[model samples]
Target: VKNAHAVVEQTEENVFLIPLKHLRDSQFVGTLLVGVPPQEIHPIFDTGSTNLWVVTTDCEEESCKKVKRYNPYKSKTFRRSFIGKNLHIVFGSGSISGSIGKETFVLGDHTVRNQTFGLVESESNNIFDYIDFEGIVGLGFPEMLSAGKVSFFDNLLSQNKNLSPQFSFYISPEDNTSTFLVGGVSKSFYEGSIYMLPVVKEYYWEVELDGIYVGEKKICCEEKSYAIFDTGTSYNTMPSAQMKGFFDVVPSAPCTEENYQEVLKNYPVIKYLFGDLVIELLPEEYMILNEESCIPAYMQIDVPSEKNHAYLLGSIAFMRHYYTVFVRGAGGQPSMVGVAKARAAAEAAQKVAELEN
Candidate 1:
């Protein structure tokens, strides 16, 4: 009965929520359509690095066999003239090389024409063969992109002038389901007020780190500190030697998911500081359920030659409980990232009512 008006309101404001599927808290996949006639494809909405890429039918690699491959030949809109040379992308798992392809890209109800992205021809990593998602849609800035090309988010903003200069994320703590809000944010997913932090580098969603509270004891880097609020990664990676504090304080929980509450009381509550904005990370957020044991979802990176580095707060560290907003600042203002606690249970419904009326 209300279908027409519902869609009209969403389209007019250019604000809509894209459904995200959580793959055992390891990966988050969202539906995206590329090429003409738009065959459905699931891509991981990654914020760590820049570059939109997918496996095409052209790839004869073992990784391509199990996944759905995009056939550019079927798309009338696939531009051969815009195709670029193969580019290599490397991550912890392995490396992938693909040629660039420009085609019509679809995100939910929004349609973007001539979106340039990579078409993988070789996936060196066997890990890709078993992954749930098809490709990756990077929300990273141009500086971090390997080729210095305009990122998918930037292209979306440029094509739609009236769209909000921000996109948001909501990872539900209960079911692990997440929402990717395109070009806008909603108060329904968050509690209290959002704290906006200045982007340290124009690169990633980098923010300054004033300090960290490992259950009340304040410890920080002797040198300057910063963190990247990245949703692309699952485990938080930090330079353990540089900070030289905190981990010893957090003890692993000796409980399973069913009895997680039993050990919750004794586990340390973590907190992060960015200027006066202090956000607490409950034991529930850090203690990930790994089989029968609940382990902290963080990795200590000790690089010998590398000096001070920024904290890598992956999805496990931040997004699981924080409603994050990636802001594109204007009028001489630097781009910023906003975070507020994700409202759990009935608080979110109440907050929505307050925000609306």
Candidate 2:
């Protein structure tokens, strides 16, 4: 494990901040006021998707009416570079389709001029209805963009040479307020040491995953596997075959105080290995113990063959545990990813105990 704190402190520049609000703990969203005059738009700070998109004034869908829409005509900075460029994205919940366009995007104090994004013309299903946010601010790489345009972060880096090509996320399960730091990582958000991992793919922050472990035992036999760190996804997901094997060994229990505690003690720790770093998820951390039943937080989904059996490690695995930093190559350094365990909850409890003394 490397100390990212020191590195970040030494190279801090062009830092931008975004305040994130929780959406029932399942989703986290932040507001990005776009355009010349700035139209306030609440978008999911999504790392899973590659293009920023907001519901357009043209959308007649019932779901679109519930949230704020961006009217390009109203903004002096808005620019329509093209028309009828198909922009479609499919998620675990639903899919969105729209047209591609260019506009001025304001992310925190940083301004991205001529940012290419999507305007939702039509949406299918009702996935957007429950979401508190209107749009998505994709933090993914440029390759993931449907229009193949440069990403907002890339554009920012180009405009500001002094800015560090990095962004960090601290999502706390205990509070409504979370932090998004752009251009550098915040050492205060995490504890212990930060681990660095080589990014295997630029899209979706993909990295090489060594193997899955139950306690100290390696379970899955897959020769090679990869994991994508996706903030937009609600739960972690693995291939159907591998997940089935995992579930077969772990038993679901009734959701109760006694059962929850008992299960935690009896069940083995589910560990994910990346290089030498072992991210251990206790049974309590990996299971969703609702009022009715205790279900595994991990889902079974079929990834495209093109992805080569990659696992999606989403909000469930990262939130409350780790402060994740997404880094792009800057200052002649190669692009990489970093992760560190959060000490907020632990440190807070310690302070409370000290006060009681």
Candidate 3:
């Protein structure tokens, strides 16, 4: 596997390590302090979209009042910008409406002066009501950004030449704390060489999805299919048609001990082809086994009309076995993504093997 080269100056300050807080094994939130005195706010380090926004004091919505709100009055470095338009963004599960402005955004010791972000005036979803996080900090490509605004990562890259145009995520199902490395790769996160994949589009972490398989049986034959690597989503999702085809090969079963053993005997490994590099999900990884029943972990959903026909490979797919690297292309090179297996997966695999033996 060819490693994607990072364009980072060799300095300790070039990299910033953000500790991710896991919520209910679904959402990952990181604390981002903004302004001169620094108001603490938690935002999902989302890779599926671009644009950063937090709830502001102006928001009178019930959801906004329950979470931390950024008070512009308290911050000396805060500047309300009239240049940009109001921002309205909708995700698969939630939506937000806000105004764009500039503030001093700080992450660890790194500071981005006059950072453009959204201050939510109102929101219309239950997505933020239960989660511990306040808002979202999108780390996606600048092209996908709304309201003609650059992403937080883009602004950071321009402000700091010492930093690299790359970020890596190591999230696991077993760990409470995950790692988000900016500007560099952490070799300790994964074993073996990282497999590189080309980004087919600027929107989301889009990649070519050649085909899907159940063990040796090829189920999907779409020639030019694509999948988005989305951390914001909890479950792996595919086109309803394709998902039905997959389930036909490996049937769901009741989650009794006898059923688990029987299913494991005939269980198929789910494989996704990225050109020639194949990422395999073991039967255990791809199946959701509860006390009552066991079903395929993947969800079937219609592809959004505006998405140009793409499946979503959410956190469950990558976080189980891989530490993913999202790299922004510099110069004329196309942006690339990389992934390697994490230590947690190896340990989990070993434990499973022991139980099987």
Off by over 4 Å in 3: 1-11, 82-84, 250-253, 256-266, 301-308, 345-357
The residue-by-residue lDDT of candidate 1 on 129-182, one tens digit each, is 567447888887777776535678888878877576678888763574578887
Model 1, runs deviating above 4 Å: 1-12, 240-246, 251-259, 301-307, 345-357
In TM-score terms, which candidate is top? 2
Model 2 over residues 12-63: C-alpha lDDT tens digits?
Answer: 3355567787777366778787898989987888787778888888788888
Question: Positional deviation of 47 in candidate 2, in angstroms?
Answer: 1.9
Kindly list the per-residue Cα lDDT of model 3 for residues 1-357, writing each as its tens digit.
Answer: 444453323345656668787777367888899897999998888888788887889898887777788898999998875665788877657777888888888876788886888888877767667665577788888877775355788888778876767887878756664767787765556787667787877877888888878899987655578878888776787776777777788767677877776676678888888888888888767676766688877777566752434677777655656778887765666677887787663232111100000
Model 2 regions lying over 4 Å from their true place: 1-13, 82-84, 305-308, 330-334, 345-357
**Better model by lDDT, 2 or 3?**
3
Total clashes, candidate 1? 0
Full ranking by lDDT: 3, 2, 1
- lDDT of candidate model 1 versus the reference: 0.72
Candidate 3 clashes between residue pairs 3 or more apart in a chain or in different chains? none
Q: After TM-score superposition, what is the CA distance of residue 223 in candidate 3 from its true location, in Å?
A: 3.4
- TM-score for candidate 3, please give it: 0.87
RMSD of 3: 6.1
Displacement of the residue 119 alpha carbon in candidate 2, Å: 0.2
Estimate the overall C-alpha local distance difference test score of candidate 2: 0.73
User: Where is the poorest 10-residue window by lDDT in model 1?
Assistant: 1-10
Model 1 TM-score relative to the real fold:
0.86
